[PDB]
């Protein structure tokens, strides 16, 4: 046999590292279709830094964003998301007066705060019609820090003109455009002057766009191809939709996302809008393209329910600490280093067959209780 002392040296006899680079990995796959291979641990998980760029000029201490949906994010969610190092995007399924009030509630309230006034950071969504011009003006007056142009298909003349108008009218304000899933879409909205990109189409838990429009993209592939382009321009991208656990968050970032947006995961929490009901304690969770949401006609989302998840004061820290441990297993001390080591090919990946996915999950038990924390 070989001398154990030569073990590390012998690795050089191999053409490349074990596993695949991100380039080799990247068809039409998404998060559950692969794993990241473990690396070398020479630091505690507590040492892991999770600072993340939301936009060109806005950086969060945590890559967590609550989605602009009327069953996920209002003032209560936005406040506590900001307090916990993330941020919330307030929905616009409401009057411009009602939305502005929610913004004021946040602004008048690791924490995400402005550098000048020390006020909590607040985001909000708007449509791309002429009526939303006045809406935005009201939100800006309320102290809005960042606006999300809310669309399933963001590459449009209407959105492009909206971007151009905001940059001229509100230069200080940061603009996140989307949604997008292709390189060509990204270039268009980057060229328009977007400060960030929202990635995803049909990956949402409550979304059926892909079913009824035949249009969208697998989330993992969308994140890679978009960010591979957008990152060259220093435009941070939000991985929006299909996120359901800590593992999805790590993978989203690995593929180039700067932050991740969550709807269903945050739906059913105490801080979410809507009241609990019993059927088991549930809350309503619905796509904004659902008939209910649109009426509150071609639906692109559904109305459903999610079980009580408790307060995000316990859930977000779980995501935070969990993501720290994830980075540790991979052998990276920050999300910045995570990005660098992936693009350099140091971090390695591996595909997962359907059998490997079943093996990866809980299997062959009479019964079990899934207590995450």
């Amino acid at each position: 046999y070989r001398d154990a002392a030569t073990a590390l040296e012998h690795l050089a006899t191999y053409a490349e590292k074990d596993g695949l680079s991100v380039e080799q990995l990247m068809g039409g796959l998404t998060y559950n279709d692969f794993l990241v291979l473990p690396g070398k641990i020479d630091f505690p998980s507590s040492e892991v830094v999770l600072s993340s760029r939301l936009t060109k000029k806005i950086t969060l201490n945590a890559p967590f964003v609550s989605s602009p949906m009327d069953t996920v994010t209002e003032a209560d969610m936005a406040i506590h998301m900001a307090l916990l190092g993330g941020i919330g995007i307030i929905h616009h399924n409401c009057t411009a007066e009602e939305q502005a009030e929610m913004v004021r509630r946040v602004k008048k309230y690791l924490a995400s705060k402005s550098a000048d006034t020390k006020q909590l950071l607040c985001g909000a969504a708007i449509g791309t019609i002429d009526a939303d011009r006045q809406r935005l003006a009201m939100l800006v007056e309320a102290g809005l820090d960042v606006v999300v142009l809310d669309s399933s298909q963001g590459n449009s003349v209407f959105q492009i003109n909206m971007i151009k108008w905001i940059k001229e009218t509100f230069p200080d304000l940061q603009v996140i455009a989307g949604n997008v899933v292709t390189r060509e879409q990204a270039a268009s909205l980057i060229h328009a002057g977007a400060d960030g990109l929202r990635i995803g189409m049909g990956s949402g838990s409550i979304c059926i766009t892909q079913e009824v429009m035949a249009c969208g993209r697998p989330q993992g592939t969308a994140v890679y191809n978009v960010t591979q382009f957008a990152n060259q321009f220093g435009v941070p991208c939000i991985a929006d939709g299909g996120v359901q656990n800590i593992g999805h968050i790590t993978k989203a970032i690995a593929l180039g996302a700067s932050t991740v947006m969550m709807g269903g995961m945050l739906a059913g929490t105490t801080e979410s809008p809507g009241e609990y009901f019993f059927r088991k304690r549930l809350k309503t969770y619905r796509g904004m393209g659902s008939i209910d949401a649109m009426q509150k006609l071609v639906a692109q989302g559904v109305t459903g329910s999610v079980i009580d998840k408790g307060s995000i004061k316990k859930y977000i820290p779980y995501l935070y600490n969990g993501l720290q441990h994830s980075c540790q297993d991979i052998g990276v001390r920050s999300l910045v280093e995570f990005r660098e080591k992936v693009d350099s090919g140091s971090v390695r990946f591996e595909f997962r067959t359907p059998s490997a996915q079943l093996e990866g999950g809980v299997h062959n038990l009479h019964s079990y209780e899934k207590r995450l924390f």
Copy 2:
């Protein structure tokens, strides 16, 4: 970082567009195995034109055809299908006298109408035996506009001779031959003088041909290979079977289909034959190769039930408006442009892993109600 002003220019640094061309996409896959990537929106969905060639000389305002099945299309269906810009193919699981009466009912009744008499367009199915010669003569007397030669395997001497006979005897009448799923089948029936082709074998919701005959083809692949050939001869093709939502319709056309035929989707509607019953309001839906259908012995279809879908006066417009929005997302202003941009490689596609398909649908909800419109 790169200057945002160079974003669109930088796209030229890439060898090809993001995603796959239809050629690259096209083994043995069907509709659910892929997506169309979104494009550029610079028009309203209302601007989208859905005019479609049914046959060489017949063009519809909507690519919707009701299947010739005794649980789908009789006079009531055919009338309302024509009124809504589509057309109905009346079944022949009935006497020649009974079928001709149904045709007369339609003819004596965006709308699909003749250019000379302004009467509603009507289609009908027949077998390929000698007895159907007289049957057809009766249908022609009733004012039939187009005939469908109804067979699971249309590439036969019997069908070929039937085609040849009709073209000689009834030159004005348009003939749709089928079903076919291969290039060789198409050439044979095109050579015979077919004015259109019916594509599909075993893709039907109620069909088990592939199970009991081991013969057929995945619908998506069948449409591509057949139309890639048939379109060179200006022979429109009907994508028949396996259509269940708007997404399937968009994809069918993307692969080369001119129109799409629906059975199960239209079964259970008010305009369909058969009475509602309760088990939940249901209607019977059965393959014409089912024992029931054949007796009203090797079965190639099944007898089943479908829930009440309501009137097609609300369902077809939903398909219509939905398809308009689908084209908009893709960035095409008509089905003609859709065809052109696909064959040129402007429209791009993406595969879907099993995980991506699960992600694409509704996932990780306690419960939900699927209200399409």
Copy 3:
């Protein structure tokens, strides 16, 4: 557009026929993973001949063989299998005296008959131990026509010596060796003097060999690789296991099988051993490697139940007529021509994605009844 008259000629512009040849098709797939593409119909299904070589010197009018299992084939099954143009292999989970009696019952009783005595053809199974030497002698005295050496793994010194002994002692008797799934296994038993081969390992409905032994092969792949070799020596092969419908039979033969063996399909029929019981009218069906079967300790099969299928006097004709229609759709007039056209590349195949398989089956119905005939 192109002139329709040139349609058939234009096919020559294509490098190869639509679809795949069997070579191109053939990893690790089985029957449900592919389809045969339809061809040209210029004959009635009644014209299709299904004569099939069971062994070097024995030819059946139907490629149907009942498996040697104590819940499938005793005298009653063997008699009626022979009468209907197939043959039955009597099990040996019984005394040598008991088995010989069953053989005598068949011999003393399209039909499969001897050319000299006009008596029904009869097959029987035996083990490969020394005790089975006397057993066989008794079966031969009873008028046995063909013997099956019954083993999950037929490539053994014990089986090889058993083959050699039979050929010397009983030259007239035909010997089917097996089971096998590889080329190397086939060569060994062909070299030993086998008159036919039994193909299959772990493909059985009641079999778990692959689970507990990690040894076996996908049935489709096994048939191709074995027969590709065995056919060069004029050694007919039985495709044994995993057959569940007419489609599987057509595909088995397409890949090189001369006949097919059925257990589960024939289990639960009136002619099968064991009594009906109620739980719905059921019969017991069990692997011969099951603890029950072995005790009537490492099990390689299970004990289960199957619903009443009725008499094989109606089921086998259904298989017969169904297979005729299958050949017709493909455009072949006999199983001999089927073999020839496949090996020449005239018959074409197509893969099936998981989606294509779901599409191929019954889908999207509230409910349905599967009446085959």
Copy 4:
């Protein structure tokens, strides 16, 4: 046709053996994704030797190791595992005093025994913190034969230093490091001075690491790549996790594992800790990363239940005799020969499509009882 006498000779006309070599087989697959092809039987299964290297200096008569989990292995399990030719690894979810007592119970009690004192061999697990240094000293005093450094991610400075310390302080003691799933991890811990490696991350039945950490590897692939490296240094590797039947054990070894570790399979047995309860006779089985286990906060395992499996005095022999039959089918007389014939390419493999896996299992039965032995 060809002369049967030339059958074996004709095999030489083929470029390579039927099926795939292990290299060709080896992406991201695991055990259920493939089969081993049968070989030549020229010996009885009783002749098969299952001696296996646990570590550099420790060899077992059976490749069976019980996992260090508080619902699997305490003194009772460890004793009977050693008696039956395997070994048990005692968990450390208990005080150092409690663990040492369990070791003494084993030491003071085909059988796995020391060569000098004839005492039963005993293994035990420990953490990699400073407190475990004293713990180990107590275990060594109790007569511990081998220590397992218990971690989901063994490639750490803490584990590396722990290894280095043990080799200096307790030279006689054998050290198994892990867990690992990559080549780079292996080299690191081999270089540190490991006497054996524990392979697996997220493949456990009760483990969700891959879900919550996005980190791990398909078990089959992990075993191959790690052992392909580790075996060059004569470092035996334990395939840990995802083992559920005899088939998995055979495959684990085929890919390079020297022994296999079982948790769930041995959970629910009489010799396991914890009492039976009724819900059907069940026992608790839980991941050591479960909240319950950790509290007896980011969970990486779950708490569940498994049905009563009976005594391992009947189960392990079943595994033993089953593995013998498995080797026989493959045509190897020992696990050593198994290794040699695989690396030489004599043993062949075959992929399994999802259809082939369904075909491989029990299918198309009304009902069945799975009696393994």
